[PDB]
Design a binder for this molecule. Structure first.
Ligand code: CLA
Ligand code: CLA
Ligand code: CLA
Ligand code: CLA
Ligand code: CLA
Ligand code: CLA
Ligand code: CLA
Ligand code: CLA
Ligand code: CLA
Ligand SMILES: CC1=C(/C=C/C(C)=C/C=C/C(C)=C/C=C/C=C(C)/C=C/C=C(C)/C=C/C2=C(C)CCCC2(C)C)C(C)(C)CCC1
Ligand code: SF4
Lengths: 37, 61, 732, 80, 144, 39, 107, 165
């Protein structure tokens, strides 16, 4: 019970290619530009 | 310390002319901290040939 | 001000874009954070080490999983001579149908990459036969990676943070790491070899289902407890053994044969079992040396205080070195990097020549890729060893604790050291370049019989001492009437002699005047890189141009245009200048390795022996000749499977060239350009409604050197990787 | 801010003061040298770290030293 | 000598307007205002680029950074034998006089100045960087 | 003439004359003894 | 159309003699690419003698130029208001140099 | 012989390379006249080629599989098989002339440091003193080992040293 299905690159490659870089760069940008109290 | 015109040897370790020989111009007799004026026949990287030294930084050699 | 970076409020109060880069760059330099003590230093380093372990095991589990799902391992093991090892499948929606057809090679459904990492050979030799086995290994190593990441998080917790005494305990750590981490691990790998990897090569499956009901030897443990240990060397594998099957097999589990298995052209599993068993016993015995809480044992400070020679020829000797190795992490890191870099060179040099894995050295692209991969890794690690040694001199070195010892006397004769390194570098450079230019003038003027061809008689003497009957010296292993020959002749020499007298492998290749000239160029590169690195380490405290260099630290830009100007005066900048000589030197050793092996693999070693003696022969017959199918990877007639390596070849040339921009052009030009850009943005209507939060400035001097060296190095690596993989795979 | 220090080898030649493009240094009364003058750096918050003072100092070694430190908007020489 | 005050209603030099003047730093953070009194009408060189005519009497320019006011001060002091003073102005309206902060120019000794940042030792008499490890920050051995 | 000999005693002129002599000497030796590799 | 322009020959020492290649015309040398042969044919030169006389003429003119340098620096050196006559300089250079140059060349 | 190398006068690729160079030179020769200067220069080239191959076969050089002369750099093996003329006699000849140059330069430096203008005698070369030392430099190995044995070859530790040492 190990083999991931036949549709798996079509989701996982654009996920870590586009969605997680967008979320990660937005999150790191908001963390960089945050003011200290 | 040494008289005018005599040769000394520099023992200030961060001097350019450390462990080398210069010539005494004058020794100031006030309470100045570095009175011994020594001239050197070669220039440092700044192009200076003259420096003040202390009494325990020069040895008449 | 701003929050990032949390470790430095001096950087957090920076109103510019320099803050982001310097927060990225000073993140893992824990000795220079705000409020850092020594216990906190060692604890965060311990957690980071756990993080490194978790990343390595996740990397290995990912390699296993992508092979097990998208490769052809179970099909490769049936005929590993004619089938190419698949790395992972390609999903690129930017492709076209010719590219999908081209990277769909076989036997695969869609587009794949063909692996050049040797993992199929390594996994097949250690006993993998199916994909499920690789799935179980991937799940196991992912669970191990999760355990190490959790253990880093756990040993950060305040009920689990170790004290400074636990980190500064050297005898316990050497006893546990020699006896357990080296010895018991090597013993357990011997257990894996004997129990699994040898019967899998005999054609018998020994998995977890039956490893308790299958005998490793037909008389188990009775020779081992009787002392009749030679009963495990009886009946070895025959010289007509088909690997992985039962035809031509034996019963032995621990032989000592020398040379190679005849089919796979690789080391014997029984010899590797015996080898790991012997070094396991030696490391377990050596792991009982130092004094832990049991009365017996050696005291390292006592050993160091004792080894001071008479007559004062080393002064105080090794007095006070224990408190300077123990208290400094940069000394320990430089020692570790020097050892691991030399061992990585050892791995590459011994794995091309003595290939361990089944059907390695018939996969020529795997041979070239693994050699070049560990040689460049070794070069970077050696440069880091000298870098952290210079950091040791600047930060950790106390002169009063070392008044008179070996470390102070090196600083005393640093000028003699740098002078004689300068001499050997100038000598090797003048005469190596002069001999190559001389032979080029001879080859240009039509007279090859005038060119200076010095024969490498010293290394040929050494090969004759090793047992090679080509050069006719005939002594010590090449003469049949020798004591060493006659004593080793009964047991391990008959395989070693056949393997060293075979001229169809990399075991002690035939050498000539080209090999002379290149080994001299290699010595030039080594001595020169050592000159820059030793000069940067020993002039790190200060020089006559700057006596107070220790007061600015390790990586400062300069000391201004005064005193004639002081550019690249820092020890970091000496490292920076020496990375170029590292890349040059490894480029020389891998050009040499690759061209001598391409001429071995094609069949005409006469081509290397003739054209290697002149640099036009180099440029014509290696670089121009072997890049004919590379640059035809795509063209206006179509494309094929080498188009990714043609694109990556041009990609590396581009990154190299972009690095030259940061290397040559410096800061104030770009700062003036950015100030005009700031004017233009603040005056442009309907775009000055958008304003930066961080003030844009040009990159600093040190950052510029780092970015230029980074682009330079990445382009260097990608260009030679694309050329080497594409030439070897396209022509074999 | 950049760390600017004055050392007792100063001979009060005023060269560093007339070399600084930012008015950071000044001369104070002193008794350690024949000139009865010593340099001093009371306004290092405006110092950019150009090291013209160090270029102008005649003594060997330097009597004025500039240790580049944490950057601000004044020390980076920004007009924006 | 007393600390003078900034007169914002001081006439400026005759100048057609450069692209190298003030920016949003003058509106958000600070800008500096330089003031001198001339003896005659005479052309000088603007530090931001270009030429300008100073008036006969009180003059007034405003710059972004401090080195621009020092460059114009050095020009007006070595070329025209004038005595300018330049101030620091905030968008609040806070006005900070400086240069000459003592009233006497810093290139000559004045009794009353307190010596700051003076190590009373040589540079070779500093400690090693091992002696200043693990403080609250990065430190140089010349800081102590 | 004394000043002209001092100018001929200056460093680049003597380097030119001496390298001309040394190069011509090697050229003459390679002409009359063509292609020497040993001895 | 079948002889390659060559005007440099090397001496037979240390094997560099091979550089004298088969350029045609019963000659051996380095093929030149400056275009002097085409310039000389366009100017109507037909013999080596005319080229030799042009060489002597150019050497004589070089001696005249170095004498002119020495003369106008050490013996009779022009004044600043001579150098500042730019209107006259333009008149003389546009007439005499370009104008009489191209007139005499057209001649 | 040494290292499996045949002698060049016994080697066959050496004769093949000689014949090949003669073939190229005569293919270039066969497109001229007889008394023409290109034909004379090419016949001088062929004469020098034959003389060079005969001299290298006469000197006892060792050829490989490519027919090219190989040099032996080992003092004992060279002196045993008659090959001192290719590395060993050239290295002592070089060390003689290189120490000549270095010793004449050192004597000129010591001679010009003892004046009131050493840099002036370094920019404008004292030609009689330089020729005097250049002729007297022939006894440089004897003079060098004597200055070694007196303790005057070497400066003491009055040298310039850095802050570290
Ligand atoms: C860590 C090593 C590693 C590497 C370099 C790769 C590389 C790849 N994977 Mg694989 N993957 C791995 C481990 C790895 N994998 C493991 C162990 C599993 C089993 C859980 C998978 C399950 C998997 C599937 C189902 C698929 C891929 C696919 C791919 C390809 C496309 C990238 C992608 O979207 O994957 C996504 C990556 C994952 C799903 C696993 C990552 C999970 C770990 C815990 C994240 C680690 C993050 C890392 C430490 C830091 C990165 C973030 C940081 C830089 C900010 C690429 C070749 C796709 C493919 O095959 O294309 C043809 C695809 O469909 N991977
Ligand atoms: C720093 C970057 C770097 C990278 C990316 C690589 C990459 C590679 N190395 Mg190289 N290597 C490197 C540096 C690197 N190396 C250095 C610095 C050294 C010197 C130390 C080596 C020495 C080396 C050797 C000797 C070999 C490689 C091999 C390889 C290849 C196989 C992948 C692998 O290592 O599996 C991942 C490995 C592991 C996850 C660990 C393996 C198991 C360890 C050794 C012991 C486990 C003990 C066990 C846990 C104890 C249980 C005890 C019991 C009682 C419970 C891969 C190309 C192999 C190869 O070339 O194959 C074709 C190979 O044989 N490397
Ligand atoms: C270090 C890792 C390791 C581990 C976990 C094992 C484990 C095992 N071996 Mg293996 N084996 C190993 C290394 C290892 N071996 C090595 C290095 C060799 C080559 C000498 C062998 C050659 C070998 C043979 C020939 C046989 C085994 C057998 C066994 C099994 C029973 C052993 C037994 O009953 O001992 C006796 C129990 C004791 C408590 C005595 C051992 C105490 C040790 C020596 C001291 C503490 C250390 C057990 C699974 C036997 C088997 O039946 O496999 C299915 C068997 O016949 N092993
Ligand atoms: C055992 C391994 C090891 C460990 C634990 C350390 C630890 C340390 N090193 Mg050392 N070092 C090592 C090995 C190691 N190093 C090696 C192998 C080298 C040679 C490269 C060095 C050379 C070196 C230098 C010159 C310096 C350090 C420094 C440091 C300290 C701070 C690191 C930091 O903050 O940088 C953060 C890391 C970065 C900002 C990395 C930037 C990325 C680099 C430039 C590579 C970019 C290539 C890119 C990834 C390729 C992308 C390709 C693309 C197509 C995908 C830390 C003590 C610094 C120090 O001590 O300061 C006083 C320092 O100056 N190290
Ligand atoms: C082909 C490019 C090239 C060459 C030939 C060199 C050569 C050298 N480098 Mg350099 N270097 C280079 C690129 C190169 N480098 C690059 C890209 C970098 C990165 C910035 C460096 C950074 C670097 C550092 C940090 C160091 C060196 C050092 C050296 C010297 C080491 C000792 C030696 O072997 O000298 C042998 C001598 C030569 C190779 C020069 C040839 C001499 C010529 C042929 C003689 C004259 C011929 C002819 C008469 C010329 C007539 C022309 C006329 C107009 C005058 C050597 C001169 C080291 C050094 O200087 O030690 C003393 C050193 O520490 N290099
Ligand atoms: C630095 C390495 C190097 C070495 C060891 C040599 C050595 C040699 N070259 Mg080569 N060459 C070199 C670099 C080198 N060259 C370079 C960089 C170039 C390009 C500029 C050349 C281009 C070149 C050409 C074109 C030729 C040579 C030739 C020679 C041979 C000359 C013998 C001689 O001059 O008569 C002997 C000289 C003397 C006896 C003079 C010394 C006088 C003292 C007093 C003797 C004292 C002895 C006691 C000799 C084997 C010639 C040859 O035929 O090679 C086989 C030749 O024609 N060289
Ligand atoms: C418009 C100017 C002009 C042009 C186009 C020519 C063209 C030619 N000249 Mg002539 N020549 C000229 C004026 C010009 N001449 C003048 C003023 C003199 C006296 C110095 C000469 C003296 C001269 C000699 C001795 C010879 C030639 C020869 C030639 C032919 C050879 C190629 C060449 O010279 O490149 C073409 C040149 C140019 C394109 C640049 C000329 C620009 C001039 C110097 C300034 C003109 C500026 C003008 C007001 C605006 C033009 C702007 C721009 C488009 C050029 C070619 C037909 C050779 C010949 O006769 O072969 C058959 C030859 O032996 N010329
Ligand atoms: C104005 C620009 C100009 C330039 C660049 C040239 C250039 C040239 N002329 Mg031309 N010439 C020119 C104007 C020019 N001429 C005009 C306006 C006329 C009409 C009178 C001539 C009439 C003329 C004749 C008849 C000849 C030349 C020749 C030449 C060529 C060789 C002359 C030489 O270099 O020896 C330097 C000149 C001397 C050493 C002069 C020596 C004394 C002779 C015998 C002249 C005696 C009388 C004279 C007045 C003095 C040379 C390409 C010669 C040539 O090569 O034709 C193919 C040639 O025979 N020219
Ligand atoms: C630069 C290092 C070096 C190296 C690697 C060699 C290598 C060699 N030498 Mg040579 N030699 C050298 C420098 C070197 N030599 C120097 C500088 C001298 C002058 C002092 C000699 C004088 C010399 C003589 C007289 C002989 C050799 C011989 C040899 C060969 C065998 C000896 C051996 O293996 O010892 C390893 C080499 C060293 C440790 C370097 C020191 C060399 C010492 C000073 C002399 C060694 C001679 C040896 C004792 C004789 C052995 C006889 C042999 C038949 C067993 C071997 C190829 C012998 C030979 O001809 O073999 C066929 C021989 O008879 N050498
Ligand atoms: C800077 C610095 C540093 C670093 C250093 C380094 C980096 C080093 C390296 C080093 C190295 C890297 C070294 C090496 C070495 C090696 C060796 C030492 C080897 C040896 C060998 C041997 C001895 C062998 C022998 C043999 C043979 C040859 C053959 C036969 C076998 C036998 C075994 C016998 C430190 C940290 C300390 C700190 C201080 C500073
Ligand atoms: S560095 Fe620039 S600013 Fe700081 S003191 Fe020296 S001159 Fe004045």
């Amino acid at each position: 019970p190990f083999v991931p299905p036949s549709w798996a690159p079509s989701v996982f490659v654009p996920l870590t290619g586009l969605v997680l870089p967008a979320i990660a760069m937005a999150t790191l940008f908001v963390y960089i530009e945050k003011e200290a109290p | 310390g040494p008289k005018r015109g005599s040769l000394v040897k520099i023992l200030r370790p961060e001097s350019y002319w450390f462990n080398q020989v210069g010539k005494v111009v004058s020794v100031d007799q006030s309470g100045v901290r570095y009175p011994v004026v020594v001239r050197f026949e070669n220039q440092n990287y700044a192009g200076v040939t003259t420096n003040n030294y202390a009494l325990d930084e020069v040895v008449a050699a | 001000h701003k929050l990032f970076p949390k470790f430095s409020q001096g950087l957090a109060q920076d109103p510019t874009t320099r803050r982001i880069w310097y927060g990225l760059a000073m993140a893992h330099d824990f000795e220079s954070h705000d409020g850092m003590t020594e216990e906190n230093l060692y604890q965060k380093i311990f957690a980071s080490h756990f993080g490194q372990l978790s990343i390595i095991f996740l990397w290995t589990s990912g390699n296993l999983f992508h092979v097990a799902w998208q490769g052809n391992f179970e099909q490769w093991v049936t005929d590993p001579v004619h089938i190419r090892p698949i790395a992972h499948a390609i999903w690129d929606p930017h492709f076209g149908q010719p590219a999908v057809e081209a990277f769909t090679r076989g036997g695969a459904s869609g587009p794949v990459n063909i692996s050049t990492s040797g993992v199929y050979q390594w996994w097949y030799t250690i006993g993998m036969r199916t994909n499920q086995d690789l799935y179980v290994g991937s799940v196991f190593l992912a669970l191990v990676s999760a355990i190490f990441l959790f253990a880093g998080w756990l040993h950060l917790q305040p009920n689990f943070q170790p004290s400074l005494s636990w980190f500064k305990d050297a005898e316990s750590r050497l006893n546990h790491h020699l006896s357990g981490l080296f010895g018991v691990s090597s013993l357990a790998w011997t257990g894996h070899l004997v129990h699994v990897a040898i019967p899998e090569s005999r054609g018998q499956h020994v998995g977890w289902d039956n490893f308790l009901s299958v005998l490793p030897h037909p008389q188990g443990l009775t020779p081992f407890f009787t002392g009749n240990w030679a009963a495990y060397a009886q009946s070895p594998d025959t010289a007509s053994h088909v690997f992985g099957t039962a035809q031509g097999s034996g019963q032995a589990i621990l032989t000592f044969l020398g040379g190679f298995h005849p089919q796979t052209q690789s080391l014997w599993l029984t010899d590797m079992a015996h080898h790991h068993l012997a070094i396991a016993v030696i490391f377990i015995v050596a792991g009982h040396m130092y004094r832990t809480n049991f009365g017996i044992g050696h005291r390292m400070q006592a050993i160091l205080e004792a080894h001071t020679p008479p007559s004062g020829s080393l002064g105080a000797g090794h007095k006070g070195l224990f408190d300077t190795v123990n208290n400094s992490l940069h000394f320990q890191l430089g020692l570790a990097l020097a050892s691991v870099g030399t061992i990585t060179s050892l791995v590459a040099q011994h794995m091309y020549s003595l290939p361990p894995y089944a059907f390695q050295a018939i996969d020529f692209t795997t041979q070239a890729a693994l050699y070049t991969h560990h040689q460049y890794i070794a070069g970077f690690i050696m440069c880091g060893a000298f870098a952290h040694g210079a950091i040791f001199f600047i930060r950790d070195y106390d002169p009063e604790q070392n008044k008179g010892n070996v470390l102070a006397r090196m600083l005393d004769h640093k000028e003699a050291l740098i002078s004689h390194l300068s001499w050997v570098s100038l000598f090797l450079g003048f005469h190596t370049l002069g001999l190559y230019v001389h032979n080029d003038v001879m080859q240009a003027f039509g007279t090859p019989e005038k060119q200076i061809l010095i024969e490498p008689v010293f290394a040929q003497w050494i090969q004759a001492a090793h047992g090679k009957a080509l050069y006719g010296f005939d002594f010590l292993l090449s003469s049949k009437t020798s004591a060493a020959f006659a004593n080793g002749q009964s047991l391990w020499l008959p395989g070693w002699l056949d393997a060293i007298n075979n001229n169809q492998n990399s075991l002690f290749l035939t050498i000539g005047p080209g090999d002379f000239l290149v080994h001299h160029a290699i010595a030039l590169g080594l001595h020169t890189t050592t000159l820059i690195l030793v000069k940067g380490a020993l002039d790190a405290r200060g020089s006559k141009l700057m006596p107070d260099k220790k007061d600015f630290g390790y990586s400062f830009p300069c000391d201004g245009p005064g005193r004639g100007g002081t550019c690249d005066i820092s020890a970091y900048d000496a490292f920076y200048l020496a990375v170029f000589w590292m890349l040059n030197t490894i480029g020389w050793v891998t050009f040499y390795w690759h061209w001598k092996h391409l001429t071995l693999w094609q069949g005409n070693v006469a081509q290397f022996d003739e054209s290697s003696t002149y640099l036009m022969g180099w440029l014509r017959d290696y670089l121009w000749l072997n890049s004919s199918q590379l640059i035809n990877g795509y063209n206006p007639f179509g494309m094929n499977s080498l188009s990714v390596w043609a694109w990556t070849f041009l990609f590396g040339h581009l990154i190299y060239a972009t690095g030259f921009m940061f290397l040559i052009s410096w800061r104030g030009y770009w700062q003036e350009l950015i100030e005009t850009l700031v004017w233009a943005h603040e005056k442009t209507p309907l775009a000055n409604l958008v304003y930066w939060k961080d003030k844009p400035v040009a990159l600093s001097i040190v950052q510029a050197r780092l970015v230029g060296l980074a682009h330079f190095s990445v382009g260097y690596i990608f260009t030679y990787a694309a050329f080497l993989i594409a030439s070897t795979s396209g022509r074999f | 801010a950049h760390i600017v220090k004055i050392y007792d080898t100063c001979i009060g030649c005023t060269q560093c003061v007339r070399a600084c493009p930012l008015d950071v240094l000044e001369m104070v009364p002193w008794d350690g040298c024949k000139a009865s003058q010593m340099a001093s750096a009371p306004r290092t918050e405006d110092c950019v770290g150009c090291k013209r003072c160090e270029t102008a100092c005649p003594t060997d070694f330097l009597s004025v030293r500039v240790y580049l430190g944490s950057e601000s908007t004044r020390s980076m020489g920004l007009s924006y | 000598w007393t600390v003078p005050t900034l007169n914002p209603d001081t006439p400026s030099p005759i100048f057609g307007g450069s692209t190298g003047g003030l920016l949003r730093k003058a509106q958000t953070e600070e800008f500096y205002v330089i003031t001198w009194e001339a003896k005659k009408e005479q052309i000088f060189e603007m530090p931001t680029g270009g030429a300008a005519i100073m008036r006969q009497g009180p003059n007034l320019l405003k710059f972004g950074k401090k080195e621009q006011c020092l460059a114009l001060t050095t020009q007006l002091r070595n070329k025209f034998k004038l005595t300018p003073c330049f101030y620091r102005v905030f968008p609040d309206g806070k006005v900070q006089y400086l240069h000459p902060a003592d009233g006497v120019y810093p290139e000559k000794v004045n009794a009353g100045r307190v010596g700051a940042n003076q190590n009373m030792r040589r540079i070779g008499q500093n400690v090693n960087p091992i002696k200043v490890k693990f403080s609250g920050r990065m430190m140089s051995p010349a800081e102590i | 003439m004394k000043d002209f000999t001092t100018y001929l005693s200056t460093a680049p002129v003597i380097a030119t004359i001496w390298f001309t002599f040394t190069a011509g000497l090697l050229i003459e030796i390679n002409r009359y003894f063509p292609d020497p590799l040993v001895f | 159309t079948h002889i390659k322009p060559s005007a440099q020959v090397v001496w037979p020492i240390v094997g560099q003699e091979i550089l004298n290649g088969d350029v045609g015309g019963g000659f051996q040398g380095i093929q030149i690419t400056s275009g002097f042969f085409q310039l000389w044919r366009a100017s109507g030169i037909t013999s080596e003698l005319q080229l030799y006389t042009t060489a002597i003429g150019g050497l004589v003119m070089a001696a005249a130029m170095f004498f002119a340098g020495w003369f106008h620096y050490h013996k009779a050196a022009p004044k600043l208001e001579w150098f500042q006559n730019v209107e006259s300089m333009l008149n003389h250079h546009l007439g005499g140099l370009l104008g009489l140059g191209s007139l005499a060349w057209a001649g | 012989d040494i290292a499996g190398l045949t002698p060049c006068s016994e080697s066959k690729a050496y004769a093949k390379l000689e014949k090949k160079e003669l073939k190229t030179l005569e293919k270039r020769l066969k497109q001229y006249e007889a008394d023409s200067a290109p034909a004379v220069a090419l016949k001088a080239t062929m004469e020098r080629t034959k003389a060079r191959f005969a001299n290298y076969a006469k000197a006892g050089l060792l050829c490989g599989n490519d027919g090219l002369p190989h040099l032996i750099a080992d003092p004992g093996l060279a002196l045993k098989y008659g090959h001192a003329g290719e590395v060993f006699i050239p290295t002592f000849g070089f060390l003689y002339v290189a120490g000549y140059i270095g010793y004449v330069g050192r004597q000129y430096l010591i001679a010009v440091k003892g004046e009131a203008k050493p840099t002036d005698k370094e920019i404008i070369i004292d030609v009689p003193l330089a020729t005097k030392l250049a002729w007297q430099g022939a006894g440089w190995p004897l003079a060098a080992v004597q200055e070694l044995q007196r303790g005057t070859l070497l400066e003491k530790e009055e040298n310039i040293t850095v802050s570290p040492r």
